Amino acid sequence: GLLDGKRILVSGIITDSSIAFHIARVAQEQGAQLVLTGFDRLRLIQRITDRLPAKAPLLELDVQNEEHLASLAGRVTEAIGAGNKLDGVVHSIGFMPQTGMGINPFFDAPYADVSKGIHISAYSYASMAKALLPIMNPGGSIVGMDFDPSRAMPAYNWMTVAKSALESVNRFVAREAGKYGVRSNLVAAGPIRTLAMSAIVGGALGEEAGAQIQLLEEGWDQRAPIGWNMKDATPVAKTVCALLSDWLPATTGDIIYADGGAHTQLL
Amino acid sequence: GLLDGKRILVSGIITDSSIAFHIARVAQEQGAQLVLTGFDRLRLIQRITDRLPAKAPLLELDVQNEEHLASLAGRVTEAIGAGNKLDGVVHSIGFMPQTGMGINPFFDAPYADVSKGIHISAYSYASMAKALLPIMNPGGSIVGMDFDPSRAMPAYNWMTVAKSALESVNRFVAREAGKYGVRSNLVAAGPIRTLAMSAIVGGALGEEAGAQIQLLEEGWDQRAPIGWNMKDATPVAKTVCALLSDWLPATTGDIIYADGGAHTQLL
Amino acid sequence: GLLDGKRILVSGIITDSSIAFHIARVAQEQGAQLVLTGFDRLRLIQRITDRLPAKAPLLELDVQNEEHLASLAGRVTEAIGAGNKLDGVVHSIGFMPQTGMGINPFFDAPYADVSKGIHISAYSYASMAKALLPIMNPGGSIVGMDFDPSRAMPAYNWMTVAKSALESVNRFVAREAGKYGVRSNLVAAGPIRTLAMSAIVGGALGEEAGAQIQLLEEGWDQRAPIGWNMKDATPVAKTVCALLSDWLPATTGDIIYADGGAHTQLL
Amino acid sequence: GLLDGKRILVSGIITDSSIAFHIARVAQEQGAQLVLTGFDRLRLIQRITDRLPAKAPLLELDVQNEEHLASLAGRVTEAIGAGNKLDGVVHSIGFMPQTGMGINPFFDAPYADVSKGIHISAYSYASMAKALLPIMNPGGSIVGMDFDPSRAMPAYNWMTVAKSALESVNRFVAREAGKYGVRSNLVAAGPIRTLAMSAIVGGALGEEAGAQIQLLEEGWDQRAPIGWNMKDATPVAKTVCALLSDWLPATTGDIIYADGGAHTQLL
Ligand SMILES: NC(=O)c1ccc[n+]([C@@H]2O[C@H](COP(=O)([O-])OP(=O)(O)OC[C@H]3O[C@@H](n4cnc5c(N)ncnc54)[C@H](O)[C@@H]3O)[C@@H](O)[C@H]2O)c1
């Protein structure tokens, strides 16, 4: 296995179409031993993760909760056994209140809503690194999920701002993680049809937003020299595993694009 | 004058070494009629602005205050006369609590502090545009101040994250401002010895931070093919005026670098 | 005038729809004294430039000719009067053999053809700077024309490669020009309907190429928050003049986008 | 092995300190079957490659020779057996005449010299893809070696221009390779002490150039959050293998940085 022998924490599973679900599956398929973290709906998450090809302890983590973060490393050591450390950490967490996205005008998102989304989507990447670096091995790897924010786009609005912040946060985390011999990188994925995304295409955030996202997705597949399949999260999961492995040992504070190559093409 | 006939709002004056002070002076020298906004220390700001070559009404604006923002456009119309509109807006506002900068570890900044700094330094750019676009003329120009955050740097820490967010916010504001025939751009300046900056070089934020900033400044002048004078804000002020003029009419959602060309050179 | 008192060399006029024609007109309108250079069809170019609002000496310059380059500075001093120096230089020159563009497959362009196009389109920017820097004043400005090559696009093929090279060349020229107190920058323009461009939309380079360029142009106007008018070179000409003026005195080795803001937006 | 079962062509071995030598070794260690190409000194190259952990046919390829390129695919099919196709191609080829580098002024490089270097260093990436795509399997991978040219640097001069061109060429090759289900990417490596590099540090290209390169190398290790060891090409070789594997299946037309993370940090 690509990840034979590695212990890896994976956050952000909420359904079987979560990107993190597929990351965890591929990791296990490749020999990794996992510990999982979940937010709020733990009974639901345990039931969902029963389907992973191997068993994995599930810990609760609300990244807005300072007590969960304070105790996190202790709980992970319990789950993996004293004297053992993590080789990998996957941050697959994101959220923006509805007022910060969709047909709600960009200017009408209240700061308290934006702030919550930046807290969960960007700041928390630093939070998790802080909690977990003290229990990671040299040669370890932290990975977060990015959506390319270098240009503005319809509908995504404040979530795109949050991703811009996350990319900057990642460059600082690399500085800190480096002292532990640990790498920190983001994977910028193409659009993937998770439950939330389908809901949005379905009009959950307004009809104009839905039309624009659908148009965004189609342009993506068209631009990608190898195509893009929004229904298949597997190529994204493999890329995260590549970064978790020993095969990109000199890459840190960086962004790997798993997007079909769409971002390298104009038309 | 470059700005003959234009009405321009300029925020962010707090001392005579403020970048906004120099922006206002050059603007007046070039024919602009100004309205100013100031935060908290209004008696002090009025006394400082008495030195500008022309008189200009001073309005109070705390960008964290929804009532100031709600009433802002009304107060500006009063100051410039009903039936008159702004041709320009200068956002020169920034702040990060001390815990988000300097030798205080990156991981130790509490979210409430980071959030305040992102509110003032990034979100407020959207806030001001929202308040002011309804009273701007076609062909108008909004300009904000940026410090190039595309790479991590010592000491600047969470302020750099805030600037990453601001750059993303600027691209969205351009989308909105475009409907009014208005441009939105940032100026990325080299480091300038304002009062705060000198204090930091002096060790106000820890000795290690001060040493790194001083080293940052020296490397800048060295890399800049035309040099960089941290004691002279004038070349920055001129660049902002260039963007306020009619001479960059097809540039928007963009960043103009006034940094001596330092960012284009590695060594 | 924005350029009152400045002496400026402007290359690249071949017809009245040339971008350089419009650059020269706006410059003269703003007080500049011009010297022009033309390639090959000098009788035609003189007849075209008779229409400029002021008279200007026309010198012959084939940038592939080492003797023209060797003698250039001497001929310019003759035209503007001994003891006088240039304040500005405009490089508006570009060419790629047909085999390097359009429906001719990317892989089928012979190196000799690509090389000719890189010579004229990229190397020559360094050539002109070398010839002219010895006769420029401190505070001077060199400007070249760019088409944003950071992403691949249909049809433009090897010309896009040439522009990638030009951007890199510009960063080096800034290093050299800096010793003379001279700036060097590119303007990245949106697509403009010159004679060549219309011919291409008309199918001169194959029907598939024409269809793609037309589609490129439409997407541009759509993405640009302030729109893009491919039939109007004026906003581009003004931007070049902005860079020729004293109003961007700390910008060098850089790229200014005059493209309606299209490159800052994804959809 | 990471590359179990894959057939891979590797160019650019000239000594045992060549980056391509280390790429080939790691590939073989990971299960790949190799075919090698060499330029000019074939007796020397065969003797050097005898040290690889497995045997591999050596073919002659001068990328400036149209007959070598025309016959290349035929010769590779012979070496790997009719009915067999390549899964991978490594372009590790670069050259710039001495006049285009070092203390020789940037402006003094003659175009014929620059052109030769762009031919070998940039155009040839397209040349090799053209020759080899007809004999590659779906899911295949082409990889080239890059040195980050996004900013100008002392000494590297026209070689940096060549790399700028190569990055642009790579984005076009991805467009073509995509039709075959093949990816195309570059690896941007930190500086590595090959024979040529040591010679340059030793003053082979002038003392000023040597001093600047040495200073470049030191700054690199300092900026890299995980450090950079210029004497160890292994982390670069692993990264190339990562791209040759099935573990980055949605990345194309892109650049992966194997540079210690140096390019993500300012100071
Ligand atoms: N779906 C896409 O098209 C797309 C594309 C690129 C990147 N991404 C990113 O990938 C990541 C995963 O998203 P997804 O598409 O798998 O969506 P998802 O809804 O399946 O998962 C998002 C996860 O974030 C968790 N979360 C929300 N608030 C939390 C908090 N307070 N504490 C802990 N966890 C919290 C949710 O429980 C959920 O598990 C996100 O960062 C997203 O921005 C998504």
Ligand SMILES: NC(=O)c1ccc[n+]([C@@H]2O[C@H](COP(=O)([O-])OP(=O)(O)OC[C@H]3O[C@@H](n4cnc5c(N)ncnc54)[C@H](O)[C@@H]3O)[C@@H](O)[C@H]2O)c1
């Ligand atoms: N000084 C530098 O080296 C440097 C470099 C590049 C960019 N910048 C940016 O330029 C801008 C101006 O900074 P400066 O260097 O002139 O510093 P400064 O201290 O002189 O001005 C900052 C201004 O922000 C104002 N401010 C703070 N909180 C506010 C709030 N709640 N509401 C309204 N105003 C508020 C302050 O009153 C002050 O006037 C900032 O955005 C800064 O980040 C500074």
Ligand SMILES: NC(=O)c1ccc[n+]([C@@H]2O[C@H](COP(=O)([O-])OP(=O)(O)OC[C@H]3O[C@@H](n4cnc5c(N)ncnc54)[C@H](O)[C@@H]3O)[C@@H](O)[C@H]2O)c1
């Ligand atoms: N038209 C567009 O959509 C567009 C967009 C962005 C940038 N540009 C760039 O603007 C510049 C001007 O192009 P244009 O659109 O005005 O086209 P144009 O055909 O009007 O002008 C190109 C000029 O280059 C000159 N030239 C060709 N070979 C030469 C040589 N050997 N020596 C001296 N001059 C030579 C021609 O005489 C002509 O005057 C070019 O660099 C072009 O790439 C064009």
Ligand SMILES: NC(=O)c1ccc[n+]([C@@H]2O[C@H](COP(=O)([O-])OP(=O)(O)OC[C@H]3O[C@@H](n4cnc5c(N)ncnc54)[C@H](O)[C@@H]3O)[C@@H](O)[C@H]2O)c1
């Ligand atoms: N050494 C570094 O610090 C560094 C850093 C980043 C990228 N790179 C790149 O890595 C690649 C390999 O370089 P290296 O450092 O291993 O140097 P090297 O000298 O060991 O290898 C360069 C190879 O290019 C070959 N070559 C030259 N002309 C050729 C031609 N006409 N046809 C076929 N082959 C030809 C040479 O035979 C040699 O094998 C180059 O592209 C280089 O630019 C090098």
